[PDB]
Design a protein around this ligand. Sequence first.
Ligand SMILES: *[C@@H]1O[C@H](CO)[C@@H](O[C@@H]2O[C@H](CO)[C@@H](O)[C@H](O)[C@H]2NC(C)=O)[C@H](O)[C@H]1NC(C)=O
Ligand SMILES: *[C@@H]1O[C@H](CO)[C@@H](O)[C@H](O)[C@H]1NC(C)=O
Ligand SMILES: *[C@@H]1O[C@H](CO)[C@@H](O)[C@H](O)[C@H]1NC(C)=O
Ligand SMILES: *[C@@H]1O[C@H](CO)[C@@H](O)[C@H](O)[C@H]1NC(C)=O
Ligand SMILES: *[C@@H]1O[C@H](CO)[C@@H](O)[C@H](O)[C@H]1NC(C)=O
Ligand SMILES: *[C@@H]1O[C@H](CO)[C@@H](O)[C@H](O)[C@H]1NC(C)=O
Ligand SMILES: *[C@@H]1O[C@H](CO)[C@@H](O)[C@H](O)[C@H]1NC(C)=O
Ligand SMILES: *[C@@H]1O[C@H](CO)[C@@H](O)[C@H](O)[C@H]1NC(C)=O
Ligand SMILES: *[C@@H]1O[C@H](CO)[C@@H](O)[C@H](O)[C@H]1NC(C)=O
Ligand SMILES: *[C@@H]1O[C@H](CO)[C@@H](O)[C@H](O)[C@H]1NC(C)=O
Ligand SMILES: *[C@@H]1O[C@H](CO)[C@@H](O)[C@H](O)[C@H]1NC(C)=O
Lengths: 413, 99, 368, 50, 205
Amino acid sequence: KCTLKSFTVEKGIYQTSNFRVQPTESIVRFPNITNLCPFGEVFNATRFASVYAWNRKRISNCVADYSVLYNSASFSTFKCYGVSPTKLNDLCFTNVYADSFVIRGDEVRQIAPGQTGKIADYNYKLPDDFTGCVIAWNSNNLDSKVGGNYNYLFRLFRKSNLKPFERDISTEIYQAGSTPCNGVEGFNCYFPLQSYGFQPTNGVGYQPYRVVVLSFELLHAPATVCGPKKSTNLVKNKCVNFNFNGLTGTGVLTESNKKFLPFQQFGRDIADTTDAVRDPQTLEILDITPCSFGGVSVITPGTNTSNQVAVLYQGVNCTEVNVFQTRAGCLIGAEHVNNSYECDIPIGAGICASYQTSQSVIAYTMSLGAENSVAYSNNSIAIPTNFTISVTTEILPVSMTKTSVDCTMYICG
Amino acid sequence: IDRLITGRLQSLQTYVTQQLIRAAEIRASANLAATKMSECVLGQSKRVDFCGKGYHLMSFPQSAPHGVVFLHVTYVPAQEKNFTTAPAICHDGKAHFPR
Amino acid sequence: DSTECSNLLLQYGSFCTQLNRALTGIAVEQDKNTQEVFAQVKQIYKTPPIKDFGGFNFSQILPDPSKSKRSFIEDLLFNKVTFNGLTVLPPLLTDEMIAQYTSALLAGTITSGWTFGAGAALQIPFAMQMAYRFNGIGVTQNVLYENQKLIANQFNSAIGKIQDSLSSTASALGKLQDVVNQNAQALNTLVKQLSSNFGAISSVLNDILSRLDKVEAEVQIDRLITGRLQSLQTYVTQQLIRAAEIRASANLAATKMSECVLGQSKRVDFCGKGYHLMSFPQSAPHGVVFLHVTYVPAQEKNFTTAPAICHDGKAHFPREGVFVSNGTHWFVTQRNFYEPQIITTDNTFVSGNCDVVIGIVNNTVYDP
Amino acid sequence: DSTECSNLLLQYGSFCTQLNRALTGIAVEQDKNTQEVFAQVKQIYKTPPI
Amino acid sequence: AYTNSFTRGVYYPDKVFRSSVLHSTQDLFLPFFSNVTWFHNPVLPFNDGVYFASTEKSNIIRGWIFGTTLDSKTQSLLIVNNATNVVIKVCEFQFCNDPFLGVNCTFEYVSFKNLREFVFKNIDGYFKIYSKHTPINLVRDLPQGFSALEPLVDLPIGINITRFQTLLAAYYVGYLQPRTFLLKYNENGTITDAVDCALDPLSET
Ligand SMILES: *[C@@H]1O[C@H](CO)[C@@H](O[C@@H]2O[C@H](CO)[C@@H](O)[C@H](O)[C@H]2NC(C)=O)[C@H](O)[C@H]1NC(C)=O
Ligand SMILES: *[C@@H]1O[C@H](CO)[C@@H](O)[C@H](O)[C@H]1NC(C)=O
Ligand SMILES: *[C@@H]1O[C@H](CO)[C@@H](O)[C@H](O)[C@H]1NC(C)=O
Ligand SMILES: *[C@@H]1O[C@H](CO)[C@@H](O)[C@H](O)[C@H]1NC(C)=O
Ligand SMILES: *[C@@H]1O[C@H](CO)[C@@H](O)[C@H](O)[C@H]1NC(C)=O
Ligand SMILES: *[C@@H]1O[C@H](CO)[C@@H](O)[C@H](O)[C@H]1NC(C)=O
Ligand SMILES: *[C@@H]1O[C@H](CO)[C@@H](O)[C@H](O)[C@H]1NC(C)=O
Ligand SMILES: *[C@@H]1O[C@H](CO)[C@@H](O)[C@H](O)[C@H]1NC(C)=O
Ligand SMILES: *[C@@H]1O[C@H](CO)[C@@H](O)[C@H](O)[C@H]1NC(C)=O
Ligand SMILES: *[C@@H]1O[C@H](CO)[C@@H](O)[C@H](O)[C@H]1NC(C)=O
Ligand SMILES: *[C@@H]1O[C@H](CO)[C@@H](O)[C@H](O)[C@H]1NC(C)=O
């Protein structure tokens, strides 16, 4: 009634809707998890270098879990710049560089973009366009020593402040005033680097803190460092949403006989649509079939005779949806009948429906006519002894309604 | 306004294209009706099933809104009997055929 | 099945309803086209168990009961001709129902001639039916009965050449294979147009929605909607134009069923070349085949001829036939087969005197 | 003959090829229409001189 | 010297199975019947990519170098069949300027009687290698016939090339050019024939 925009419906079959199976679940497949990164070598080292001349470790060609860098009790503070702490486990990078150093507990605020003062302007300058993470922890149990640890130095003097990441190692005497250095200190001639001298009795502002900055890069080059190959169990003989190595689709997956060559991953149909895939965790081939769909047609004797209807799910098997499987599709609400009649309402593939016996929609194989063996022989003839004058009506269209449209008044007006 | 012009012009092009395709079908039907007027109202057609079923005697035109109706009058043979038959008969040693 | 695209497509209004309404008219017409060719027979006529047809052998065109019970020739014809929201619907009559109609048309024709087309089927012996078909081309029926073994052998031999043609090449069925090819090429083109960008950043719809913010993604998706909607309007317009050509062909096939199979046509070249005797339908994939049987005259001789002849000052004309001479004697013959009769007062009619007719010749006219 | 336009027109896919193919079907039909009417004679018959 | 390439140098263009089908593809291919340059070891251009092949029985050729300068200055590819297995490194190599094998680094990887055939190309920071090995009867030239080259490696090196040289008894070099090919896939998903669509008017048909 709504499809026809009418409260009265004539006898017929009408398409009212489209049926569609929907994915029952989602699956993901990637290859077996392999080549995990040795990130433990960055954080568990015996000592680091001086913050004026920090030490760099390279990580490449591997996969990792980064969530440990804040879920571990080992790290007193964690930050990320241009990156989110959860999103690390989904991201990828060309290389990872760990910049490693020690500073006193007051100073950790300096390891941030656009900072000013001694660490930022003389030791480790961070720009706005940086991409990476900062891992910081108290190390008074590791780096402090009796009589004071002098292995850690910081720059205090320079001719001008650092550019972004300017690792200036130079040790020459800064001339603050009248005394020329000649390779040594004097009145207002001073050595540009200062010792921390870390001792275990220090207060929390003067205790050593270890820092690692994970200085990431992405180039014009591809990635080499990534999150893990997140995967599910496999599903077969049901409509699912799927992902194989990043190839995504929806369909019914099933085992197949198709013999791919050892390097081939995906199969395509003559119209370039994907028709098969390899499971990356067990190298057998699956056919893909589309998730089932078709027209929905309503069969009615018309509202002037009944509110009863049958419904045809065109091309659908009744498995997907009285109930009866025709070759036109699954037919619901019609009685199958073993008689045959003239076609009342056509369903397709030799099937028709009518409203009959106290009454219901019935479905039957249509009848082409009564059979007749003609009484033929080599010497028998039939001759008509009488006639009927017959008058027959033929109706033919001759004209349409003549129409005119002003294209400017239709479009504009 | 150019979004409305684009959609309304495509809407009107779709209408005129399907009216051109529908007019060609109505012209085929009118050419058939003009042939039935000549061959069955103005003549007695010997063409099988061109003008009703059975052997055509004559037909009459009646007008209808946007069309024509033909009333086709035909002879239908009605009450058959079976007989023995022969292609020829033999008389004075010579074969006779029905004239 | 993208929800974001689906809500933008609502801005285009009725277009998706009228594309389906247009294609539904095409689909209903293909069943109507088929019904008008094959369902011309009121009853499913069937041939007797014994085949006493006067020497004519229909075995290659009648049903094979061991087979759908297609004929031998219908099986050759069925061998030689050979999903993104798109669906193919079944025809209403199955190939087995089409073959029951061509079987009933053929059985009615063989057992009752033209009579089953005009009323009840009236049986007649097959050689006596072929004698009436000889009278229908203007050859006297004694010419059939005196040559019946020759005419039957020429028919049986000419049917054998159909089997050889249909076994030795596929090239004859090119009209039916062309229809299969055109509809496949149109659907493949419609699917391949889903890979086109139409000016968008990508043709993949989820790829756009992953790269872009809501208001920018809508501008990219409206290009794919525009191009994919134009892609369907192009397919549906082409199917509407192509269906009008198939309907013209099915109207012709329905006319050849009535005039060539249910009757004997006088219309020159309508039912093959030569004078039409009869024709037989055979079903084929998406189509029909007519086997048209015609009389062709074969071995002409020259004769002298005259428009009239002179006897007792009266001018005589032939009632049917033409006056001819072998050089010494004058005869009258039927026009389409040389069979010379002596000229008599009942082979001929008088009209006026010897003075008027240009080219009249003197002869005796015998008076029995 | 602009290459800048031609590379944009490729993004519309099959539309250009199926327009050329449609007009080629029109053109081949005109020769068929003409042979169906006029080529109905097997031999080039000639009248006598008298 | 030079010799006719015939129908050789076709490789599988992508990781996709196709079967019983004719596929039209546009990519860098060796044009049909073009000349290869023939050698019995100079530095050579790389262009858009290279087809390389050798008639062999001596096993004299062992590897290749690819780069911009092929020098200690900058990152370049070294590829060697190191008797046990294939070994690859990307480095600024300090070896002799006419390099041979006896009768920093950014990346590393580990894997007449016959014709050995290879294709090399570099696209958006990936280095592609394809190959085939076959028996032969012809001595002096590439044998007239067909066999498609299958991929070996797809290395994410991020580094570019303009020249190459061979490390080491006779071998052939041709250049890939942007071409359209029609490729014939059989039931078992192998490429079994091809048409170079620009070769002649019949191939274009
Ligand atoms: C023209 O036809 C007549 C009749 O068929 C031929 O006359 C007959 O010829 C044979 C052989 O000479 C005789 O046995 C018959 O007795 C003849 N009949 C009569 C009535 O004369 C005549 O020979 C034919 N002429 C030509 C030129 O062929
Ligand atoms: C993946 O791991 C499982 C369990 O170790 C093993 O059975 C399977 O063969 C592996 N698949 C591949 C492709 O290595
Ligand atoms: C319909 O589905 C069932 C499986 O549930 C299958 O056995 C049957 O053969 C199918 N029938 C058709 C006609 O597809
Ligand atoms: C049709 O025949 C089947 C099998 O004999 C039977 O189960 C069914 O009840 C019959 N239905 C009707 C309405 O005859
Ligand atoms: C012929 O039919 C009419 C009715 O149509 C009937 O009245 C008449 O008696 C019949 N004549 C013969 C000879 O059967
Ligand atoms: C005589 O003809 C009728 C039909 O008019 C038929 O039913 C009957 O079977 C025929 N007679 C015989 C002996 O078959
Ligand atoms: C009819 O023709 C077929 C094929 O030539 C042949 O096998 C059959 O024996 C013939 N039948 C008769 C009765 O001659
Ligand atoms: C008829 O006459 C013409 C002209 O004399 C001649 O060419 C021809 O061979 C004759 N015979 C036949 C059978 O036409
Ligand atoms: C027939 O035509 C010829 C010229 O071709 C002429 O000589 C002759 O007189 C004509 N005869 C008649 C009866 O017209
Ligand atoms: C035909 O007969 C008439 C009357 O007997 C005669 O006058 C005329 O000369 C004859 N013509 C010929 C050509 O024999
Ligand atoms: C090679 O790569 C570098 C860095 O991407 C680039 O500067 C250079 O122009 C490239 N050279 C060639 C010949 O492509």
